[PDB]
Amino acid sequence: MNPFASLTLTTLTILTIPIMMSNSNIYKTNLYPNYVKTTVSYAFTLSLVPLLMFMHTGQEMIISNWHWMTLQTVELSLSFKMDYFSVMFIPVALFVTWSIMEFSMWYMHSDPFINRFFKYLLLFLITMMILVTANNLFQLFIGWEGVGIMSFLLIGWWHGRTDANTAALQAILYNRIGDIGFVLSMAWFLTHSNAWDLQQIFMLNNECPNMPLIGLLLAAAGKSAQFGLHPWLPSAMEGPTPVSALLHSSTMVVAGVFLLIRFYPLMETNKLVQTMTLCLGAITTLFTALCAITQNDIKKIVAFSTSSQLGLMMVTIGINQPHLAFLHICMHAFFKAMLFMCSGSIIHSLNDEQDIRKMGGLYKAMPFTTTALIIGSLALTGMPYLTGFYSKDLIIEAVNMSYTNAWALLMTLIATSLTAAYSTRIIFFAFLGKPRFPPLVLINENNPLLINSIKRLLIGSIFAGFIISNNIPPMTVPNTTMPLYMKMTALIVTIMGFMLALELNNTTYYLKFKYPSQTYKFSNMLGYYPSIMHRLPTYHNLSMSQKSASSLLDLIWLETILPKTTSFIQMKMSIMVSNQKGLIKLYFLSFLITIMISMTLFN
Amino acid sequence: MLKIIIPTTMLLPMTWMSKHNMIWINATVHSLLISLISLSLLNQLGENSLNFSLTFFSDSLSAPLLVLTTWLLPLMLMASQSHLSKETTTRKKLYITMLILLQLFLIMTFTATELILFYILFEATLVPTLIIITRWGNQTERLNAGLYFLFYTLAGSLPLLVALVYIQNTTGSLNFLIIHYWSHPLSNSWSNIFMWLACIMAFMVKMPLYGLHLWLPKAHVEAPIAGSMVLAAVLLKLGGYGMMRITTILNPLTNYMAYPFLMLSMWGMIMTSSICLRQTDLKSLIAYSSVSHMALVIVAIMIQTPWSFMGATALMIAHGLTSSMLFCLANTNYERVHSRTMILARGLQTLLPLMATWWLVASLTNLALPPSINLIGELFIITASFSWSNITIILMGMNMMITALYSLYMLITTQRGKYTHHINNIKPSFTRENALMALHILPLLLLTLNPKMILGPLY
Amino acid sequence: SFPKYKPSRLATLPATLDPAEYDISPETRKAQAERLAIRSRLKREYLLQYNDPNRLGVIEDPALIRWTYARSANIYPNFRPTPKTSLLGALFGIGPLFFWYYVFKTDRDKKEKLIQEGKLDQTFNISY
Amino acid sequence: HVTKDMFPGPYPKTPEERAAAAKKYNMRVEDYEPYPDDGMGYGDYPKLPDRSQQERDPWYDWDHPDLRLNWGEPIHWDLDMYIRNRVDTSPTPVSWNTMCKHLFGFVAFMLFMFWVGEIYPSYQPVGPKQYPYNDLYLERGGDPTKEPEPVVHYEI
Ligand SMILES: CCCCCCCCCCCCCCCCCC(=O)OC[C@H](COP(=O)([O-])OCC(O)COP(=O)([O-])OC[C@@H](COC(=O)CCCCCCCCCCCCCCCCC)OC(=O)CCCCCCCCCCCCCCCCC)OC(=O)CCCCCCCCCCCCCCCCC
Ligand SMILES: CCCCCCCCCCCCCCCCC[C@@H](O)O[C@H](CO[C@H](O)CCCCCCCCCCCCCCC)COP(=O)(O)OCC[N+](C)(C)C
Ligand SMILES: CCCCCCCCCCCCCCCCC[C@@H](O)O[C@H](CO[C@H](O)CCCCCCCCCCCCCCC)COP(=O)(O)OCC[N+](C)(C)C
Ligand SMILES: CCCCCCCC/C=C\CCCCCCCC(=O)O[C@H](COC(=O)CCCCCCC/C=C/CCCCCCCC)COP(=O)(O)OCCN
């Protein structure tokens, strides 16, 4: 009865079977990656049904099957929430994961531990599913830590590389800084509303105070790589290309924005937190776009593009349009996964080369790859009637006509212009000029796995925006009437960015040379943020850890106070008392003295 | 209870009349059998207790600690089976005798319906530990470590005896049931302040509190493996158990006498977590981690709220199991390397993959990862302290971040990277070590399914 | 003319911009020769101990043992109470404790005063 | 298997003592400089340059390639601080002072301009939104037994 609950639990259950089978015999063969890919595809095609039923009726449901434990008046149970957000984000994540796994079956064919890689990917997918479908804050925290741990394990895939371990530890550090605010919010909610369940939290908090919302915003900033804690996302590219294509591109990094979306009934009631998150989104999108303008590593450019999109949806949350932010999450998944898959194809075809200085004429050498990358870039920049349009155009329109901060407006407009600019930079520097790779041409894409994985996301990034936009009930008040000049501001600014970037990139052909300006050095070195913030704090803290805490206090003064002073005093007293020459003259003189003292004192 | 105490006593004649080549088998089998018998005690009721007789009673606070104590001994035997290969039969039998005596004293301690009997066994637990540390220790600093461990404990616990006999003289009984039922408020006076200090300091020194923790790194570093696990797992919980038992008569003085200890613990957790980052030794790093966790437990107990007590019990059990596992892994590394230095052996994951998996699981559990009971206790204490004051969250979050940092530093330095070239005696890991790690870790992931068994009487 | 690179503690002077190796004197060459000589002596000892087929253990490193002993077990015997050491110890071991005590005492006093006045709105605060 | 002499010793004022220590640490006598004789317990341990350990010659055939170390050479007091996994002092293309100045200026300017824009917000030439039933009084909070003051809307 009502297959909604049955299928919505069965998808998450069937995603777990290969993990159970990982100790079986199939794990020791080469059939495991295909097994995992088929399992993910079946889970996607099964979870596609609750989406249809929700679209037809508007079905919503929460399932609290297993009662974990009761703490006096609080009950913790394994509760899954299957609202619009969950039922819509399950198929997108499963589809992207299916394409990424099929791509990895070709990209990582030479890795001896490919089965372990696929098992790690499946574990990350399961944990993200748990995070998305969670109903109480404890289960959400379980997913929150699981995705972070899987990201740590997958960033440092190559244990020999020191930079991989450094990036993994850096990501864990920033995620724990966010978890500080997450735990603050959890504790506040339990101690004030007496429940970690979302229903009671929504009901009991008509006017949510500043502290829990600031904690939630800090957690979202930590995991979505906002300006305060951005560098971990660009640094997380030390892992294999499929990992950065699935985890740190479209699925794991949208966890903070999804957390902010989930608590939107409380966000609207507070005005200071909305302003703070809008400002954070604006500053971070501008900063990462500006950094991506002049980057030279392709994966770095796409990572900064991901960070900019994350900041854009944080801005969308700021102007109180959570559903639009969710829609942009859904579209960005598709086209950003496309872009990373194309970048991985180029990298593999060019013998593990990532610098765009060594990519030349690939428009004709790799026709399917360049057409996929062109479609993805045009969708990203906001070309009308594409997947990115249905989200970004509405984002900009809603942002332009709200009683918001003006500096955020200007920053968002400059950010989208710079987005167009760096898309132009990627295309021009990797597909237009004369070839610059080593003479031994090893270009080859004629592999069915790569072609099929790219074409599925191609059909997606072409039609899914239209399908999803026209197949869901309305949840926001439309902006029907708008000034014509402001109606086209997104297109005008994107075209201006295209023209400016192309004109400035064409000047590199001229046979003139000039040393860089201060602005170029600032933009290439990532605002000098990774340098200073990774040398000034850390060092100092570590210095104290050896100077004050370890040596000076523990090994010197704490030893001097209790044990050493006692030892010295007892040694001195023992030396004083036991040093008697053995003369009975002094003994009996002391006896006379004590006899006199007791005679005159104790009477 | 005698169904548990009597077999533990019979373990001694069983060991002493065993054949020269079968002591380990018999000791392990019968220790495991004893643990199964101890499982029955776990079924506590929401009412008072399982008052067995006039001398022994069991609560839902004593049950998890008793089960852990009975479970630890087989693991101690399997850990000690390695370095005692070249030891004479009499000395091996003496070692097993010391371990059995320690278990018997702990079992009699944890129930101990009367406070003077509790104190007597609480100090009796000190002789076998000192003998183990100072006799079967490798380094030449084991003597100084034994002296520190003896005197730090005894100096704190000596005023406790005077306080207890004074309480018996005035109150008239030291039975814990009568003490709980007839409790009366403590007036704010200098005499009552010093009674509070005498009754508290004896348990705070053993936990240990920051500033009195100097004995713990020495005792943990210089002791053999079995002494290390019994110190980190059970002997640290004696102070917390005693404090949670004895804070029933110190109200309402504690309401303002907890400030120095609360501040000391909430700052020493940060200090020792930072110390763990810059460490050249593995066992010292694990010992300082234990100090940090016990400081958190001290904060929880001093807050004195139901969530504080539940989190304190959960953290006690979880930290015991995790620290025992970490000491096991460090000992397995040291046996092959013979150096006990973190950066001397590197990249061991390429050579020993399964031990790398065990290292990862132990570090994740120490990192307080959900839904493990480590994080259950951590989060309960965090919420209780937040209710106590909203500013504690800063210190607790800083501690959490530093804990993650040093845990992953310990994992990365010893497991990841390029292997050291001039070491060629890294033999494949035996079945004994893998079984030891599995038996350490599986109870944690099993207890995460039934948390109510380790949440204490205030559940 | 070009802007000068000013080194700092966390960004040291590059070897190329350093002027010590441009003012070369015969004693500097002698010093470099001795440095290379002792380094090569150590390298030869290590390689002789490293390629030995009979060796089946870990090559003990005197430098590592010396470093560990200096870091851990040689701090107190070389410690002397001086105004700098005493001031640093008092500050770093006392100031944070009293700072946090004052902060928490003030917060709890404010909370208790609000409770006594009753203007705190403690509704639904069941768990504590 | 190490003699007592090999172990670290207290700071020595005399040149002969200094020479003995420099030879012990496997370094030149005039290349050896102990930490200043302060209260801190450095004692007789060479004060190697604070130069990091990431920027050692990456092409030399080190005995420990990952740490960039040689067997037997003196070890920096703060090696665990500089292991290429932590703070490194590699020279940077831009000076440290100018880097700090530029970053602080950018952040402060951004914050100031965000505050300025908050002072002067941006909106549209429209009036407040109008909701039918007493500004949706029943649907926001409820309290139906209070009969709120009824707000009427002006058709224009
Ligand atoms: C309502 C009316 C609507 C109309 C509005 C206006 C319409 C358009 C007007 C045009 C406006 C600007 C368009 C040109 C963009 C600049 C391009 C350029 O010339 O670059 C060459 C030139 C240097 O290039 P280079 O070193 O020779 O390159 C070496 C090779 O070429 C190596 O080359 P490569 O191959 O390695 O890579 C080349 C790469 C490398 O290029 C770069 O170096 C990146 C630097 C350029 C980014 C600047 C663009 C936006 C800046 C936003 C700043 C936010 C506030 C930050 C505040 C900082 C305060 C310190 O360049 C590119 O790929 C493309 C560049 C981006 C162009 C496309 C997007 C720009 C259009 C959007 C901006 C305005 C339209 C807004 C639309 C919305 C309507 C309002 O750039 C500059 O000279 C900088 C110009 C602007 C910098 C402003 C910041 C000055 C701050 C000084 C201190 C102020 C006092 C602070 C006091 C603080 C107290 C606390
Ligand atoms: C399909 C079934 C699934 C569930 C199976 C569960 C099996 C559980 C087995 C494990 C039991 C754990 C031990 C429990 C010990 C605590 C209880 C014990 O103390 O009770 C004693 C009784 O214990 C039993 O008599 C003996 C049980 C010991 C053996 C347990 C089964 C497994 C033993 C395995 C040993 C090794 C097997 C062979 C290996 C080669 C004394 O009872 P008593 O205080 O008088 O009772 C008074 C109340 N009365 C009057 C109503 C009775
Ligand atoms: C070092 C590592 C840690 C070791 C353990 C540290 C914990 C020990 C600290 C002791 C806790 C507090 C002790 C006394 C608390 C009472 C409150 C008192 O201190 O405050 C004022 C008391 O005034 C003064 O403090 C009087 C005492 C001054 C003398 C005590 C020594 C102070 C410094 C010594 C520090 C040494 C500690 C370590 C010793 C080895 C309030 O004045 P008043 O309201 O009128 O009296 C309140 C008591 N009444 C109500 C019963 C009358
Ligand atoms: C690791 C080292 C730790 C050392 C711990 C030592 C300090 C422990 C705290 C003080 C211990 C002694 C307390 C006495 C035992 C309690 C007995 C009691 O409460 O009776 C009081 C008696 O109180 C006392 O006599 C206390 C006198 C204390 C003398 C010994 C001083 C020891 C050191 C004092 C300062 C230490 C406090 C901080 C120690 C921190 C740890 C170093 C009631 O007196 P009545 O006769 O009944 O009066 C009723 C009629 N009006």
Short mmCIF file of N, CA, C and O in Angstrom, two decimals, chain A residues 176-222:
data_model
loop_
_atom_site.label_atom_id
_atom_site.label_comp_id
_atom_site.label_asym_id
_atom_site.label_seq_id
_atom_site.Cartn_x
_atom_site.Cartn_y
_atom_site.Cartn_z
N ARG A 176 35.94 20.43 10.09
CA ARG A 176 35.76 20.47 11.54
C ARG A 176 35.46 21.88 12.03
O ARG A 176 34.68 22.06 12.98
N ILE A 177 36.07 22.89 11.41
CA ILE A 177 35.73 24.26 11.76
C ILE A 177 34.24 24.52 11.52
O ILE A 177 33.57 25.17 12.32
N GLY A 178 33.71 23.99 10.41
CA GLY A 178 32.27 24.07 10.20
C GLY A 178 31.47 23.23 11.19
O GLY A 178 30.37 23.63 11.62
N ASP A 179 31.98 22.06 11.55
CA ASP A 179 31.27 21.20 12.49
C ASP A 179 31.15 21.84 13.86
O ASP A 179 30.26 21.48 14.63
N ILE A 180 32.05 22.77 14.19
CA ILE A 180 31.90 23.50 15.44
C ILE A 180 30.55 24.21 15.48
O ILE A 180 29.77 24.07 16.43
N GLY A 181 30.23 24.95 14.41
CA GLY A 181 28.95 25.61 14.34
C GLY A 181 27.79 24.64 14.24
O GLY A 181 26.71 24.88 14.79
N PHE A 182 27.99 23.53 13.53
CA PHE A 182 26.93 22.52 13.45
C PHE A 182 26.57 21.99 14.83
O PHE A 182 25.39 21.88 15.18
N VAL A 183 27.58 21.67 15.64
CA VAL A 183 27.33 21.15 16.98
C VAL A 183 26.72 22.22 17.87
O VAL A 183 25.87 21.93 18.71
N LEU A 184 27.15 23.47 17.70
CA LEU A 184 26.52 24.57 18.44
C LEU A 184 25.02 24.62 18.15
O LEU A 184 24.20 24.73 19.07
N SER A 185 24.65 24.54 16.87
CA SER A 185 23.24 24.57 16.51
C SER A 185 22.49 23.37 17.09
O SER A 185 21.38 23.52 17.59
N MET A 186 23.10 22.19 17.02
CA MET A 186 22.44 20.99 17.55
C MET A 186 22.18 21.13 19.04
O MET A 186 21.08 20.83 19.52
N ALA A 187 23.19 21.57 19.79
CA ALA A 187 23.04 21.72 21.23
C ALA A 187 21.99 22.77 21.57
O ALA A 187 21.17 22.57 22.48
N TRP A 188 22.01 23.91 20.87
CA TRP A 188 21.01 24.94 21.13
C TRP A 188 19.60 24.41 20.87
O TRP A 188 18.69 24.63 21.67
N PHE A 189 19.41 23.71 19.75
CA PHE A 189 18.09 23.20 19.41
C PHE A 189 17.60 22.21 20.45
O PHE A 189 16.44 22.26 20.87
N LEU A 190 18.48 21.31 20.91
CA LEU A 190 18.03 20.35 21.91
C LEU A 190 17.72 21.03 23.24
O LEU A 190 16.72 20.71 23.89
N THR A 191 18.57 21.97 23.66
CA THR A 191 18.38 22.56 24.98
C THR A 191 17.25 23.58 25.02
O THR A 191 16.77 23.90 26.12
N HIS A 192 16.80 24.09 23.88
CA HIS A 192 15.71 25.06 23.86
C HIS A 192 14.40 24.49 23.34
O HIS A 192 13.35 24.71 23.96
N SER A 193 14.41 23.78 22.22
CA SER A 193 13.20 23.22 21.65
C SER A 193 12.93 21.79 22.09
O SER A 193 11.88 21.24 21.73
N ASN A 194 13.84 21.18 22.84
CA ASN A 194 13.65 19.84 23.41
C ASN A 194 13.44 18.77 22.34
O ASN A 194 12.75 17.78 22.58
N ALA A 195 14.03 18.95 21.16
CA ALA A 195 13.92 17.92 20.13
C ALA A 195 14.91 18.20 19.02
O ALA A 195 15.10 19.34 18.62
N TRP A 196 15.54 17.13 18.52
CA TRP A 196 16.36 17.20 17.33
C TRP A 196 15.57 16.94 16.05
O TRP A 196 16.13 17.06 14.96
N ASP A 197 14.29 16.59 16.17
CA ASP A 197 13.47 16.31 15.01
C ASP A 197 13.09 17.60 14.30
O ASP A 197 12.86 18.63 14.94
N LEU A 198 13.03 17.56 12.97
CA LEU A 198 12.76 18.77 12.20
C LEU A 198 11.36 19.30 12.46
O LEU A 198 11.15 20.52 12.46
N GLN A 199 10.39 18.42 12.67
CA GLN A 199 9.01 18.85 12.86
C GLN A 199 8.86 19.71 14.11
O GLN A 199 8.32 20.82 14.06
N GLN A 200 9.35 19.21 15.24
CA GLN A 200 9.25 19.96 16.49
C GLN A 200 10.07 21.23 16.43
O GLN A 200 9.67 22.26 16.99
N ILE A 201 11.23 21.19 15.77
CA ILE A 201 12.06 22.38 15.64
C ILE A 201 11.32 23.46 14.86
O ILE A 201 11.32 24.63 15.24
N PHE A 202 10.67 23.07 13.75
CA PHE A 202 9.91 24.03 12.97
C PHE A 202 8.74 24.58 13.77
O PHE A 202 8.44 25.78 13.71
N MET A 203 8.05 23.72 14.51
CA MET A 203 6.84 24.16 15.21
C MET A 203 7.16 25.08 16.38
O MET A 203 6.53 26.13 16.56
N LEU A 204 8.14 24.70 17.21
CA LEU A 204 8.38 25.41 18.46
C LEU A 204 9.12 26.72 18.27
O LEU A 204 9.23 27.49 19.23
N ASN A 205 9.63 27.00 17.07
CA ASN A 205 10.45 28.18 16.82
C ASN A 205 9.73 29.06 15.81
O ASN A 205 9.97 28.97 14.60
N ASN A 206 8.85 29.93 16.30
CA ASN A 206 8.19 30.89 15.44
C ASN A 206 9.12 32.03 15.05
O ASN A 206 9.11 32.50 13.91
N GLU A 207 9.94 32.49 16.00
CA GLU A 207 10.94 33.54 15.77
C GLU A 207 12.28 32.99 16.23
O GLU A 207 12.63 33.10 17.41
N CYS A 208 13.03 32.41 15.31
CA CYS A 208 14.28 31.76 15.67
C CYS A 208 15.32 32.80 16.05
O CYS A 208 15.56 33.73 15.28
N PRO A 209 15.95 32.68 17.22
CA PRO A 209 16.99 33.65 17.60
C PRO A 209 18.24 33.53 16.75
O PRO A 209 18.30 32.71 15.83
N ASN A 210 19.25 34.34 17.06
CA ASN A 210 20.42 34.44 16.19
C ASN A 210 21.37 33.26 16.32
O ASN A 210 22.01 32.88 15.34
N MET A 211 21.49 32.68 17.52
CA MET A 211 22.55 31.70 17.76
C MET A 211 22.43 30.43 16.93
O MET A 211 23.42 30.05 16.27
N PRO A 212 21.29 29.72 16.92
CA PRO A 212 21.24 28.49 16.10
C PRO A 212 21.40 28.76 14.62
O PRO A 212 22.03 27.96 13.91
N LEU A 213 20.87 29.88 14.13
CA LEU A 213 21.00 30.19 12.72
C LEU A 213 22.43 30.54 12.36
O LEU A 213 22.91 30.19 11.28
N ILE A 214 23.14 31.24 13.25
CA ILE A 214 24.55 31.53 13.00
C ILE A 214 25.36 30.25 13.01
O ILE A 214 26.28 30.07 12.20
N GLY A 215 25.03 29.31 13.90
CA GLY A 215 25.71 28.03 13.88
C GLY A 215 25.48 27.26 12.60
O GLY A 215 26.41 26.70 12.01
N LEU A 216 24.22 27.23 12.13
CA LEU A 216 23.92 26.56 10.87
C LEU A 216 24.64 27.23 9.71
O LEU A 216 25.14 26.55 8.80
N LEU A 217 24.69 28.56 9.70
CA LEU A 217 25.38 29.27 8.64
C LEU A 217 26.87 28.98 8.66
O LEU A 217 27.50 28.85 7.61
N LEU A 218 27.46 28.87 9.86
CA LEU A 218 28.87 28.52 9.94
C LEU A 218 29.12 27.12 9.40
O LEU A 218 30.11 26.89 8.68
N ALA A 219 28.25 26.16 9.72
CA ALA A 219 28.41 24.82 9.18
C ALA A 219 28.28 24.81 7.65
O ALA A 219 29.06 24.14 6.96
N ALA A 220 27.30 25.54 7.13
CA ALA A 220 27.12 25.62 5.68
C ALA A 220 28.33 26.27 5.01
O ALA A 220 28.76 25.83 3.94
N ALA A 221 28.88 27.31 5.62
CA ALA A 221 30.08 27.94 5.09
C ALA A 221 31.25 26.97 5.11
O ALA A 221 32.06 26.95 4.18
N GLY A 222 31.36 26.18 6.17
CA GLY A 222 32.46 25.23 6.26
C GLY A 222 32.41 24.18 5.18
O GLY A 222 33.42 23.89 4.53
#
